[model samples]
Target chain A: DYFRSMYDRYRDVFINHINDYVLEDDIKIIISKYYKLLFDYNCLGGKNNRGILVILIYEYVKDINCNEWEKVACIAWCIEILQASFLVADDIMDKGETRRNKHCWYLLKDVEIKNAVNDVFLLYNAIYKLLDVYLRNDNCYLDLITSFREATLKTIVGQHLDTNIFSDKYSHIDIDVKININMLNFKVYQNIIIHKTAYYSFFLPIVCGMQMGGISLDNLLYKKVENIAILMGEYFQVHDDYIDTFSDIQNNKLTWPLIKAFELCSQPEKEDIIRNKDNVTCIKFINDIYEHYNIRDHYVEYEKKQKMKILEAINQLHHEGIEYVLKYVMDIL
Target chain B: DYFRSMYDRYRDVFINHINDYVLEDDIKIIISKYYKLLFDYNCLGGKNNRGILVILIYEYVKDINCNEWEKVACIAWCIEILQASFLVADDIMDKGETRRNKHCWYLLKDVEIKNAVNDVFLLYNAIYKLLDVYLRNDNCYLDLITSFREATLKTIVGQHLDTNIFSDKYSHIDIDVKININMLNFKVYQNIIIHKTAYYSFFLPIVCGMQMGGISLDNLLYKKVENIAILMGEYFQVHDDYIDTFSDIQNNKLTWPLIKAFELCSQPEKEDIIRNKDNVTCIKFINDIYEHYNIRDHYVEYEKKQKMKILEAINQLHHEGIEYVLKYVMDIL
Candidate 1:
């Protein structure tokens, strides 16, 4: 709910800002509904607090500098855009409607079905559009677009493998992977997550602030941040999967623990559970397990605890003139 | 059936050529099936021969230059790609099937339903992908892509106009249109056809061949070609409306002449015959006229003459040397 509130608050900033440039009704229909499109996509709902968390980390080592705020905001906005691009595609695959507790973005009022579908491209176009206006002439425009294009291609392959052909290709829990179980349980999810999170969320604020402050992203700094950020990204997705199951005590969708159960269960047992997913019969299995294990309502507690843990990890990563560094970041906003 | 033959011959040529590039089963499946998707949706089954006729026109004209065969072939291929791009998107919208005696591409086997919609983007990407490869260092790549993209946006706008909105925000043919009747009919239909045909049949091969010969497009050439092509495009669609009615004279949907009869008839008689498309009393009245008139085939003959008049007008506008040019153009392919 906090993430949802943060998302709407920042989304208004984007919609209000862009309306300053164009006012044709059709364009308004497109632009206005597009914001609602993003607002309604579950993927668009994220911790708007992540980029700020990154800056908080960087601040601990130095001044909470004046220029950090805008840098952090850009990073935060970029993540929402990135997630939106994926969500526009993903919601179609998942066929779910509870996106941010509303109708899916593509299904929003005033959205044509074809346009709703095609608007994924519009969301994609937004990335370059923004980069051209905001980062024009800067190599960041080319770098980010190219990198994002490649990442999108990978996500398509991942989505195809993970969801589309997933049933046909992987019929059992162990058979479901090319990567090891640990990463499957955590890291691969993070790979999608980190790309989903860190570059835009965790490191973006630090990087943008550093770039503006004459801290050229030298080789060593880039290396250090990527290594650490990957871990943070993994944690982000892991927490999300956990929260999906844990959000309400009554919800019984599969979570990390269910995956853990299947991994330890016999092959035949795993097959039976998969059959349940295939036949839409797995709900009660998950519920019965939760009742047996008393895993109910673990999500609310875990989400808050994880947020605290994430905040602590970020703040403790660097120290000293953190406050001044954050001010430097926030001032740029 | 003749169209299917042409498609089959071209399919073989295309597969053999692309075979070198896509070597494995997975890659081959993706590429071959992608084109097959297009053929299934449009080439094999489509409106009038308008799109195919456009291709035929390019072949006819380009045959004038004997040395440009391969270049002409590639451009003709691009027209096919462009048509498929539009058809894939249109099929999803129209929920059509039996394009030619086979499944509409979106309705085909093993397709990811969402991909059926996005396949147009992939097909459109084919334009630039092939352009970058075939055009070499020519900067016309951007021009070609932008030209096609803008045209597609306009077509979608036109399509949106045709589909009703629960809210009366978009332009409607009955209300917002500013053109005279013939011109309005032509503009609405022509806008789609030009993006569909003039680009597919006339502009692509001719322009691409010119670019291949290191001759950038001339304003004069585009003007002369486009002005005539637009008229031809309208003539083409009117012919389609006739075919929809005739369908070998057993299936009468609504012929233009019949519609003209009602439009021109006395208002009371028109209402008595068939006020709109479907009414039992009006249907019986129209059937009475058809039987009393006993001239279904006569109507077909008259419709052909109308089409002949348009073709004659087009022929008179072109020079006699056109066929001679086509003869030379065949050498290039």
Candidate 2:
């Protein structure tokens, strides 16, 4: 509850950082109000799944007083800020319509693409500004910052591949090359998911908690946590791909179900999929292919297997507190 | 000369960082080639003015060996990488056509808005990664990273204002308010320029060098250097606005000339200017207003005054080696 309750506290800290500049009163008020809306609209709407992971892991890792909880909660919210930053830019890049049941930030009449582009950096940089205010003197400060940077780099690389996996740059020199069916394998899917989703969404938050709870970076348990995070990311993304059928299809994304259906379908069906992947009218046809090939049923089987793998990995982590936290997350997520 | 010569070396370090991932060979090659082009096209071809400032300040701040120069040059190129990142995002937001004599990176057929948005972060995070690879053990490492973060936050704030100063969000609730001439004053202009251009362009590179050259963050010299950087940034941006006549007009941007002409014009002229501000056909009309009002002459006089102010601030710094480097920069820039 403190994690959710402390949103305004952290938001005020960042707003105050902006006010620290020597601007005219009117200008300062405008900037403050705009940024306030930015954080509220983008950071608060998420399930706080990633942010809550930080709090739960930190609490489970070690004992902490109210003061330390404040700092931990700031880090928790900082990850949410990071998530907000990525989502804003991702929506613009993907030309998204609605997020959290509201029009995408870029689609807002006043904000538009230009301000939204700059707002992305504003949200991203606020994390460090918040970290500096709350945890600059904390021993784990540098490690926390470095982990954020490294994870961001990995995410960008993953995003680049996800956006361009089927573009002309990556395709082979076939005269009629349409969809690179070779890239639809689970191996490539794992590469993109682990980098894009696993590291930032899972590993980074868990590690932030562990670092704050005084766990050393050299602990082998960190590697075990990473493995579990990757499995969880794969499970989460595969389910998302199954549920959000039309968007991925329209975007020409390489998703688990699409790949599964491609692999299981007939040669003519594969040809049809390649041709119709990005066509809006072909949505039902593709859904029929998914139904015909039983992709949803296949996803259920994959989900069961993936959950077992994640549990096995969590059991190997061996730290009861973190293991309990991981199991809790797996159950709820 | 060493600064320019070391571009390829620093480029390799970053390219190798991407290749360090456990991607398949084919995927690694594709990623590597894409990033290589990203750096080569964006980072190179500039005058290397900002990058060289790091080298010059680092060398002049203290004595150093060949190994130290290598580290210094990496930081230098990292600033260039940072510049590339900002320019990439700025061009997309501005709908820029050409940069450094080639098509803007975002306008390239293969790399559109989506990839360019992501590439901005890649280019940015690359700075800290290069710093980690080169200066992780240095005593100034944290200061270096902190300065980059602070400068980036300032730059983003400046960029947000630059993008939205004339936007509907900033305009008051006037039934017929077209331009909000109150926002077109010199006082408002300085606020945008100092944040948008001064800190990152001038202060960041200088402080980065001074930090690496063993100057303490607490030293009085940094404040002096910051003052000079702001003066230089104003001078640089004022000159840039003078030279770039049409693009700023087309984009409905706030610039030194527009502000100057607005101040000197009659009421009818101000209304006329507002009406034709964003009209492509009225570029000549705007130019005639600028010419008829002697804005170019005013700019020449302003440039002379700004250069003198920068020289006075540089002279006050008292450190001979850095003063020499600063003077050299003023000459070349």
Candidate 3:
């Protein structure tokens, strides 16, 4: 409740920053109203797992009073802001229709590609501005900012591969479909998700809290954290892939199930899958193949294995506080 | 010559950063080559005015050895990278056909909107990576990074206004053309340009140099530098408006000359100008109106006055070294 409640408090900090540009009351009112809606609509309504991760990790790592809680909450909200930025841009790129039970921000008539694209940068930069306000004098300030930058960079790289892996640029020149099949493996998927999902979704928040709780870069704990984060990231993304398999096939996206299905299918089945990958009419046929292979059952078994693996890694960390938070996150997931 | 020559040196730093993510030699080679071209194509072919400003200001602000010049040049190149990021994204929003004498990056068959949008973030984040590699230990590190972030925020705000000022969202409710004309005045225009052009184009490069020269953010010189930069930015943008009048009119843009014509023309003429904007058949009509009002001569006069205002502000700074660099920028312009 505290995390969700701080939304406007952090948002107003950016709103006031934008208002600094206008002199006329009428224009100021218009711009202010527009941006206020920008944040309200885009920043709200998420599952907010990433933002909550920040707060949970921060609290578990150290005990602090109300003043410190306010700062930590701002950091949590900034990650949500960063997520909003990524989602807005991703929706435009993906031509996404709906998000969080509402129309994607970019698809709104008034907030088309032009404003939506610019707002992505606005949301992304707001993270740093909020951080500077709350943590500029703190010893961990630069580290916090650097962590954000590094995570963003990794996410961008991962996103690039995600978009272009099956693009015409990378498609094989040969007529043989098997050539393209080589590209759809777990190795490539791991690289993409590690950069795209793992770093920002898992590592960034945990590290933010660690830094806030007086964890240094030199500590051995960070390496363990990164390892566990990546494992969890893989688990999280595999779940997403299984759930999104229907849409992923229609969009011609490479997903874990598609790769698994490819590995298990007969040669003719593989050709059938590749040729009719994005065909809407063939969706039922594709689903029959998935059912034949028991992809859902495999996903359940994989989830259990992933959970055990993550639990094992958490126990190895030897820090009870953070370990507790990690376990709590797994339960909620 | 030195600034241009160092392109490979800085590009390699970021290219290597991306390379670190890949394990396979073949994949590494492909990723490295793609990003190399990404930087070379977008970062090159500019007038290099902003990057040159960083170098000139850095040199004039203080003396440094060869090793220091390497770091300063990396900072200079990072601004160019930032410029590339802005221009690539702007071209997509503006539906631009050509940039630096080639097809806009987004229009390429291989690199469509999806990759192009993602590359914008890649190019932008490369700046911080390069800075971290070269300047992370410097006393000015946080200041340099903050300057870039604050300048980018202002630019994003400015870009939003520039795109949406005359967009359908802002059009007047009433039928009268004069109501829309009121929205096209100098007050709105100044606010847009100062944020969009002044901070990043002028203030950022200058501040980077000053900070590198060991000038603290508290120095009275920064406030003066900002005023001079804003004035110079205004001058730079007005010059751009004059040169791009033909394209601007066809694009339905709000330019200084468009506002000037509205201020000077008859009531009926104003309506005609507004009505025919973005209508290709009315190009001659607009040109005739521009000729009749002598907007060309007005821009010349505006240029002279702006130059004098900037020079006067530069003289007030009382720093001969930076003053000389500022005057040199005017001469080059």
Candidate 4:
């Protein structure tokens, strides 16, 4: 629908822009090759949720006929590239072999592991380059840049905390010897989803949309946008975790439901959960364990409540037609 | 001595700012610890050259009595933190163990390696936070942010090429098996220095100082600033390589003299040099090879010529006191 059309147009311009920006330079062959590979592989491959949402939010908030789709598309591309930057580094840190249904950039035969680190930075730099070219003349350019920077910091800090859940400091004292839910708190999980996923994925695009529409952050709706985005994003994240645990998906991601299972199970059962962690049949056993504690019931009920809360908050806003935009977000979920 | 005084002032404010910024949060104990550790061990321990240089450059260009030293110090702190961000990630990618004569942040007992990746991002985020608080209202704020972004990208790309000297992609075929100076063109070496070190280290601080002084980059003297900065930075970098090779200062840095020695040696001699690379006596052999090729003589002459060029460029600038500021930089060397 609108996402596909906007995303397609946005993708074409961004990909074309980056591919040609440095190609004409009389640089070494290797530098040109590296630049193209980053665009062709990293920039073009994402789901486009974050980027599409920017255009969608802007469209919902402003008169479509007066829109600067060209500039808006560039800003959307920046969002996509920012996410690409994060993903490239994250894959390397996690030793991920694949991403976006293709080989990760680092795993490509031509890239050295250390070079991937730089490639990630290059992706980040591309965002600024796009901003420089497209939005530097805008009055709110500093505000837009600051928002991206703030969101990025929160997201990264969330990543740092999430990793600690499996290791020391935050993990329970007994967690070194045995797995237990006491190693984590509900607030930590909420913090992770809010900072890591919600801010970048949901709040940033909406805020950016408002910024692009000439709405300053000093406006009251800015707080509401974040509040609703965080609620919906957390629900979306928890839902993904729920499905991934029950489905045939093979990623080794941390899941809230699994943490909930530990809270429900006994000391011995926690040990068994850890033992079966690698088993292909672990999904079935994990589902059974989750069922034993009624985690499924608790989570499903909470998810529904969050969805209602998000809808209710949106309903209270001054804007018309935002419901339709919220529908777009729901459909993606 | 100016660097010392400015650096001490900048360090105290920066350390206090960061330490207090996140203290009010109810974060997990591990996160606060990680934040503090990054500030204390990583940010505070460097020579403070990059950070202090910003203040120095600002003071040199601006009317000091009318200046905002606190705001300028915050900007300098951003530069320092940016360096720490890069160093943290670079150490992890290079699998380095120690930095600034202390343990690398990732290798510390409190940190997990994977988590250090996110810590680097956190460090980057802090720059934006400082900017948001101190310079967001400034019209040139976007320019300031863009300069940091641009410098960061160049630094990372240089790291990529630097690693290729050891591994693959842009590396020379024979060089990948064992590095030889013959495999590297002087252009590549120059590119590496300009991108990896020069922009962020020398040029950026000066450019930022100009920006802070309300000097738009369109000023004619700007190019001279960049030209002089690049020359000085290259001179500084080449000097470090010479000292690291010729003297007893310990660091696992790649050296031009060592590379030059390989170019001077025969095929059999190259193997011997590689074999005894870590031995103390190998330094003597390497020196003999460098001397045979007259690398030392050429480098010394080139260094003198660059120093002259830098002084000549500065002489043409309108500012009378800039010479004294340039002396401040020279005295550090």
* Residues A212-313, model 1: lDDT tens digits: 334445645554555445455445555666656553112223245556545556666555545544233465665455445444445445445655555454
The lDDT values for all models are 0.46, 0.87, 0.84, 0.69
**Weakest 10 consecutive residues, lDDT, candidate 4 chain B?**
B172-181
Model no. 4, DockQ: 0.36
Provide the DockQ value for model 3. 0.43
Any residue pairs clashing in model 2, and if so which?
A: none
CA error at residue B232 for candidate 3, angstroms: 0.9
Interface RMSD of each: 9.7, 5.2, 6.7, 6.8
lDDT of 3 by residue, A161-191 (tens): 7777786656642111112666788888888
Fnat, 2 decimals, each candidate: 0.04, 0.58, 0.44, 0.49
**Per-residue lDDT for B234 in model 1?**
44
Q: In lDDT terms, how accurate is model 4?
A: 0.69
Q: Lowest summed lDDT over 10 consecutive residues: which window, candidate 3 chain B? A: B172-181
Best by DockQ: 2
The clash count of every prediction, one per candidate, is 42, 0, 0, 0
Tens-digit per-residue lDDT, B80-150, candidate 1: 66666666665555456645566666675445455554455445544444444454344565445444444
Model 4 interface CAPRI class: acceptable
Q: lDDT per residue, candidate 4, B1-333, as tens digits?
A: 244345445444434543442322545444555566567677776688876778877877774642377678778878888889889877877777678888788786657566676777777777777776777777777788878877787777667666655334444421111443443546667767777888888888888888887787799877887777777877898887776555421222346775666666788877765555345676677666667777877678878888888788778776765667776787667
Weakest 10 consecutive residues of candidate 1 chain A by summed lDDT: A171-180
Candidate 3 wrongly placed segments (more than 4 Å): A171-179, A277-279, B171-179
Report how far off residue B242 is in candidate 3 (Å).
Answer: 0.8
* Candidate 2 per-residue C-alpha lDDT over B39-93 given as tens digits, one digit per residue, 9 for 90 to 100: 8889988887887888888877885788898888988898888889899888988
